[PDB]
Design a protein around this ligand. Structure first.
Ligand code: ZN
Ligand code: ZN
Ligand code: ZN
Ligand code: ZN
Ligand code: ZN
Ligand code: ZN
Ligand code: ZN
Ligand code: ZN
Ligand code: ZN
Ligand code: ZN
Lengths: 216, 216
């Protein structure tokens, strides 16, 4: 794995980073990138290699400022994933909300310093996620990891995350993929190397934060 | 385009079909398949070639029977896309809800004749959509097209849809894709041919329905 300081630097430069949660939790790696300047072409790559459920981790302060209510009052997800209502960008260039261009625009708009509630249409195609106030030491998830990276890198408090899947193999001429799944551990590291990205674990991110904040 | 009767037959056989809405509406093609027996490998193909936002069109009767409330009370989508709260399958084989295996399972469970509200966890990773009671003649969208195909094919009243994107081209060694977009018109037909699928327009589907029901 790469050292957390090197991951922070890459994130500060607007790159995706590959972040693995604990094997006893989801045992999954997500692509994580700062939302502020995510590009159309970057988003296309994210959609291509991920589940395609593009989420935008953000702070509680952002959910209140931008008026993004939680999707459910009785959250039945085992991990308590804090989805807000979905959004599209209210902007003249948006069309149907789903393209890489439109989803990237929604992410950039959620992160803009001048963002306001009226800048977003609800519901839509991008899924903001409310990180817990305590950060990665309080909840060891990709949502907290994204917001933590934004803080550590001095970026706007909005990230973009999605899970890296194993799309399996093409079956010539047939609408199926063979042996699909989720990318795990060593495979995630190889994925990072293939694409020139830094890769780390939430466990190491927590250890980094603890150097300054101590153990929660 | 293929004739609607041939599209219905393919859908009845559990195949994906490619359905284009009007050019003056989204001008997009979605993969549409019956939810009842969607397989892991089929879902992997769908995720690979689509936006990855896997939705499950279903009837109002299903939304009431399965207790799937609308995501928002003040729907601000221009098209009124009727998203319910998201779901995962409550089943021993589900893990994180996002894999092709898990999303396919959620779809099959939404379509099962014995489905009940307790079979689903909310929120989750599959997005049910409430078709309008009037069908494709009332709202010319992919949501209505999916439910209409289920009715026409004698299937359970739950479909699965997602938009076919243009993922652009790989950029060797870089986390970007060049020239991404949405697949349109002729490209959608070529996509169908490539994968052995039937392809049609919602306009022709409406004309088919009108043979029996007249113009709304
Ligand atoms: Zn749409
Ligand atoms: Zn849509
Ligand atoms: Zn995660
Ligand atoms: Zn994730
Ligand atoms: Zn091929
Ligand atoms: Zn997750
Ligand atoms: Zn999840
Ligand atoms: Zn559509
Ligand atoms: Zn669609
Ligand atoms: Zn390559």
């Amino acid at each position: 794995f790469d050292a957390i300081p090197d991951v922070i630097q890459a994130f500060k430069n607007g790159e995706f980073v590959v972040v693995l949660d604990d094997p006893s939790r989801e045992n999954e790696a997500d692509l994580i990138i700062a939302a502020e300047s995510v590009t159309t072409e970057q988003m296309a790559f994210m959609v291509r290699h991920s589940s395609g459920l593009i989420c935008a981790p953000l702070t509680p302060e952002r959910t209140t400022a931008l008026d993004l209510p939680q999707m459910v009052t009785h959250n039945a997800d085992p991990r308590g994933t804090a989805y807000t209502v979905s959004v599209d960008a209210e902007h003249p260039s948006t069309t149907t909300g789903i393209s890489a261009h439109d989803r990237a625009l929604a992410c950039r708009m959620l992160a803009a310093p001048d963002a306001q509630p009226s800048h977003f249409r609800r519901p839509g195609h991008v899924f903001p996620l409310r990180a817990v106030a305590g950060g990665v030491r309080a909840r060891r998830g990709h949502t907290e990891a994204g917001v933590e990276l934004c803080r550590l890198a001095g970026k706007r408090p909005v990230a973009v995350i999605s899970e890296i899947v194993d799309d399996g193999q093409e079956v010539e001429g047939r609408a199926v993929r063979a042996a699909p799944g989720m990318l795990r551990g060593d495979e995630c590291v190889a994925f990072a190397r293939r694409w020139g990205l830094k890769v780390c674990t939430i466990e190491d991110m927590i250890a980094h934060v603890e150097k300054t904040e101590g153990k929660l």
